[PDB]
Write a protein that binds this ligand. Structure first.
Ligand SMILES: O=C(/C=C/c1ccc(O)cc1)c1ccc(O)cc1O
Length: 232
């Protein structure tokens, strides 16, 4: 069993462990990073994003394809981020405001992008339109001042739990629960996927996952300088 370190991103502290809203599973901080936009050739910071994974399950699920790889190989491999997104384990995303945003701004930006992509790939069903209504519904009249958070729990059955906090505190319970795999994945893939808005969170995630898998490989590994066995 292992631990990871805490991360601080432009003043936002993401603890090494958390429990997502609506879940009993402990999660570890897999990666965190700034989300910004280049306007001018100035990098303007909008949010700090922490990506947490199910402590029980994620390493074991990822090791099979990713053990052996250096951080810079995971960081440049679209299939690694896609395995994180689509993994058979729970994920938890925490988006914490650096600049203020409103509920309508955030939800409009994400759902319009989702919808555009789904139409482009020919996979836009009534189920997705109804999931987008439900998502927009949860966000209308929320507003997010600096330090407030948006909280997403991503289930492996493809249920997205949305919740909000006024600060970095993560609440016990969930808010809306949207049973739609495409939107549940899209929300996280919008962050760490090929088109991901946080290259920083991606590089962090690659680096720390690579480290975790390497320490794990070396635990149960026979060395002559440590011969003192505990089996018969
Ligand atoms: O809505 C946002 C920004 C709008 C904006 C408005 C005026 C500007 O000058 C620049 C950006 C926004 C920013 C980051 C994000 O992750 C999700 C979002 O929805």
């Amino acid at each position: 069993m292992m631990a990871v370190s805490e991360l601080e991103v432009d003043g936002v502290v993401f603890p090494s462990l958390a429990r997502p809203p609506g879940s009993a599973h402990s999660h570890f901080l897999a990666g965190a990073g700034v989300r910004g936009m280049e306007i001018g050739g100035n990098f303007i910071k909008f949010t700090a994003i922490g990506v947490y994974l199910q402590a029980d399950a994620a390493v074991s699920a990822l090791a099979k394809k990713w053990a052996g790889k250096a951080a810079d190989e995971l960081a440049s491999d679209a299939a690694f981020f896609r395995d994180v997104v689509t993994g058979e384990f729970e994920k938890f995303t925490q988006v914490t405001m650096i600049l203020p945003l409103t509920g309508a701004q955030y939800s409009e930006k994400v759902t319009e992008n989702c919808v555009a992509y789904w139409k482009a790939v020919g996979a836009y069903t009534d189920a997705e339109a109804a999931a987008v209504d439900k998502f927009k519904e949860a966000f209308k009249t929320e507003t997010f001042p600096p330090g407030a958070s948006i909280l997403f729990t991503h289930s492996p059955a493809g249920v997205l739990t949305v919740a909000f906090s006024k600060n970095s505190s993560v609440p016990e319970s969930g808010g809306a629960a949207i049973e739609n795999r495409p939107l549940c994945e899209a929300v996280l893939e919008a962050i760490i996927g090929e088109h991901g808005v946080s290259p920083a969170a991606k590089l962090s995630l690659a680096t720390r996952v690579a480290e975790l898998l390497k320490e794990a490989a070396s635990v149960d590994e026979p060395a002559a300088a440590e011969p003192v066995s505990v089996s018969a």
